[PDB]
Design a protein around this ligand. Structure first.
Ligand code: HEM
Ligand code: HEM
Ligand code: HEM
Ligand code: HEM
Ligand code: HEM
Lengths: 237, 238, 237, 240, 238
């Protein structure tokens, strides 16, 4: 279900940050490379049940070195996996930075959009390897929920309208996080171009919706997508 | 037996205690770790007469937390003693206190002024499931809320109830009054096997009028899974 | 005498919280019993100049194990004692949680109350041994100061009216903290019955005043009154 | 031959700095002999800098949360203050000190005082209290945007009310004010000495009631309470 | 040549990275430290040509800070790589990451809609000084600000500029656009030998209308002194 987790609804997504202890460096290189192989194997073990992508936060996001984006069909499996991961010789030297869960749904407001707008939505993004990745949690203010459907739909249309041309160079995904933690949404973006993403976010600061974002970022997680090997290789040499 | 006399009756203080495990715990020999566990298991059975204690694995679902206790007692001192004892153990000595919330269970304030039909559908209380997820959300209401008169508040809670009832099928709930015991008014606690239902349930309640009056909503929002204490500690042995 | 500090005006009061380090447990039972005895002896030295009461916060207040309520006639003496205490082998393993100073005054608004109301104010709370204790620091908003005397008096009269019948099961004391730290008042309560105290606070959430408490708690310190030996005794075993 | 000493505590164009430190716990794991050696290292460093800058010391331990020690440093360049402070943190003692907080502000020509009545200027010439080992208070302050949007005359009038409410406390309270905007996250640094803290409390309550007060977006946070003392008395405590 | 090609041109990512030195570092032998220092020094020489890196002594001027890097690059990856390496070094291992802020340098948005005369006075490139103080102010504007239409924001910036120009006497400036890379919209950077002017400059700008729209202003406000890395690190060897 490689293609079935990154795309389908009813799939729980989790974002897990870690910071590496200093004492980790007090360990011998041979010991750490052993620790590295342990993790690679722990992940392969959980293959089939869950999907796991890794992002390097060291040097781009404050107080964080590593991030996991984990998709699962139940959060219990994700829980177990993370407790196991944090149990490894490597994990034991990790301080948990942060943790956000949200489920993927079919869209609420999209059906009431123009046919032409839904067309431009069918595009699934740009072709790039090892892109930058941004994660922005969001809490909407109470005023927003007090609004009726028709109003929110229209605001979200302006949201869409302003953002669509950035699907040239930006992939996106949206998770509904309400009731699972202190936010309503988790937004995720991949791009090779951060100038575009920057402009993209500015444009959305100018729509009417934005004023309703009681929390915007905090934290704003910037990292770069890479295989877990490349990441761990940095933690051994 | 007495379990339902604590989990259901009013005049019962309830406590929510979070813990995170130190790193230095793993620099210990594995054999030392397993012995420490046995201390804890016995400490609980020792308190098994006076109080009730439930455990939740927060590791991997809640940031800066591995373990959680929900302790029911009819005096907080007994809850205090058990907790300082728990932290005095060799295991406890390697635990940082994450958070701590007290609240007593009371007679409902607004339910009496509801429709008769609404009171009947309330007698049903959630679903029976093993190893369920559990959520705890503390709440501080604003001064605006307290300034209101009963009828106004009662109507708001009635709308709250109305939107929530159809989720009472797949969600257990409990409510504690925390004002004056800590920096919140309410501790809300929920059990469910289905987290989307709980999610949909919360969205639903964001849309009633009460929600604007929730000055603090979560912070923290505690997600965990209910489990026997044994299952948890066993992880700290390997 | 002893009590001449718990009641009179011109008496500075200080509230000091501490959390015990973990490394303390990495110490031998021999060191700790020695360390405890040090503290017990230090306190007994100051027993003439100042008053010191002790509270167990472990298990009731997050990030706190012990609390001192120290009354003195000058903050200097309180300073000396506290700097000494933190200097002890035991103190070396305490993280300073928080610190609040406030002086006791004669009441400002009480004279402008009803004759019947002053009667019920002279009456004490209830006397019980090793009771719960709550400490709530309070910052008033600027609006509150802008109000005129007559206005503030009537508001505090409403406060009093709602609270007087809770003197059945609750002792109280109030300290004026403005300019000594980041709050205006320190409130302190003893009681055997926390359900009452709970109800007491709800009642006051409903008066007009409550809206003016910009800061209410943060932290709300819940503890139980105890002799210091009993408290430290736990930290030796 | 001195003079310059009070020429920093009084003159304008003089940067003033407030530096808090918290001592490590392991510092006490050192032998009493090791610490007193460490003390003198600091004491000499200070005497070395006695020409360039002025330094006062305050014991914050037991009065102010997360802080033991405070320096009030006056200099005519912050670099001299920077160097002295990095050096200070360089001593074996400093090596065991965590930098608590840091506030810079310059002493200026008063802005609003000139637009006061002549009688109000006279009572301002009046001095604080003369005392040894007094308590000392520091309160950083940020004014809200509303305040800056005002025209001068309006502000002058408010500060006149401020001054008027505060004047009778110059009997038992000394004061000094630093302009901190652009050097840190506050606009002003206020500093007070007194032997009587209850008077100071009253002094501050009074000003909570003027109109200016609503414009103080930040008032304290932190509020630093201490006692003024010779540096030796402080260092003597960290070994004995 | 390339020096000015990163400090002036657009499409250039700029990063601001703060570090504090751990205490356990002094328990290290001086021999160990000097070797550690040399490690850092060489790493920088390696990344030269690809990126620019400037250093600031924050020790004694900014709380919970000793050191700051300003890194200019045309990709943030190159900056990340350089920074993870730096924190990996024997010295870096003893550094706590204080903070991190990214922003791109752009061509001006509002300048064209200014008077021809205001554009004249802007071309000035500041004061001539070596080892100046340096100040960093991060900035987030409120929603009200974005809601404004172009013409209005431009007038506010015109008022901003007008009030600020006479401080190009003694102040250099640079501006970074930070939105979407972290929790702020702008990163402002200034150099000066005279801090009293910079202060007056900021007081002055606190009085225009734009200022009310600065929801976060500083927090942190980073004050330091510009210096070559050697002199800074040499402090940590003795
Ligand atoms: C190419 C970029 C983007 C596109 C095409 C896009 C499009 C959409 C669409 C079509 C929806 C409706 C989904 C639904 O009905 O639930 C939506 C929802 C949402 N978007 Fe985006 N968006 C983009 C960028 C962003 C960014 C940059 C942010 C925030 C930083 C963001 C935040 C949100 C949030 C919070 C919602 C759900 C709000 C609600 O349900 O009330 N989006 N987006
Ligand atoms: C899912 C099923 C739910 C049901 C059947 C339900 C129903 C009720 C009822 C009947 C009361 C009566 C209180 C009284 O009589 O004093 C109440 C109170 C309350 N409920 Fe719920 N609720 C549900 C979910 C929730 C959720 C999900 C939250 C918060 C996240 C919540 C927050 C509260 C709070 C804070 C109160 C106290 C109200 C006050 O005294 O101001 N409830 N609820
Ligand atoms: C049995 C309970 C209580 C009684 C009899 C009581 C009564 C009073 C009285 C008579 C005053 C007047 C002081 C004066 O005029 O100078 C006062 C002041 C005050 N009370 Fe209470 N109160 C009670 C509980 C509480 C509680 C539970 C709180 C807060 C959690 C509280 C907060 C305050 C504060 C902040 C003041 C200072 C008022 C001001 O100067 O603005 N009181 N109280
Ligand atoms: C105790 C006797 C006091 C006196 C005689 C006094 C008087 C004055 C005077 C005459 C000025 C004018 C300076 C100028 O024109 O720039 C001033 C400014 C100022 N004062 Fe005070 N004050 C006193 C206490 C306080 C206290 C206790 C605080 C705050 C806790 C305070 C806060 C300030 C601030 C922040 C300014 C800057 C001017 C402005 O608001 O823009 N003062 N004060
Ligand atoms: C001292 C000389 C200064 C000059 C000549 C100056 C000039 C300018 C100009 C012309 C712009 C807009 C560029 C454009 O039109 O695209 C700008 C942007 C900005 N400046 Fe300044 N400024 C100065 C100082 C400051 C200071 C001291 C601060 C903050 C403490 C500051 C904060 C900002 C901010 C937040 C922006 C972003 C405006 C936007 O694009 O929305 N400036 N500056």
């Amino acid at each position: 279900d490689r293609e079935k987790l990154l795309t389908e609804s009813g799939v729980y997504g989790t974002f897990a940050t870690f910071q590496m202890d200093h004492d980790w460096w007090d360990l011998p290189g041979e010991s750490r490379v052993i620790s590295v192989a342990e993790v690679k194997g722990l992940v392969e073990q959980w293959s089939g049940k869950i999907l796991v992508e890794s992002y390097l936060l060291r040097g781009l996001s404050d107080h964080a070195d590593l991030m996991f984006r984990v998709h699962a069909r139940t959060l219990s499996d994700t829980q177990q996996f993370l407790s196991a991961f944090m149990g490894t010789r490597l994990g034991r030297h990790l301080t948990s930075g942060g943790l956000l869960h949200g489920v993927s749904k079919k869209p609420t407001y999209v059906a009431g959009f123009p046919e032409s707008m839904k067309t431009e939505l069918q595009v699934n993004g740009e072709s790039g390897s090892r892109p930058y990745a941004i994660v922005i949690p969001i809490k909407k203010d109470a005023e927003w929920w007090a609004l009726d459907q028709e109003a929110r739909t229209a605001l979200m249309q302006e949201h869409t309208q302003a953002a669509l041309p950035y699907l040239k160079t930006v992939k996106e995904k949206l998770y509904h996080s309400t009731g699972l933690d202190d936010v309503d949404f988790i937004t995720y973006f991949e791009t090779e171009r951060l100038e575009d993403f920057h402009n993209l976010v500015r444009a959305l600061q100018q729509v009417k919706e934005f004023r309703h974002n009681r929390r915007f970022g905090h934290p704003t997680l910037l990292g770069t997508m890479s295989p877990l090997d490349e990441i761990l290789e940095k933690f051994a040499q």
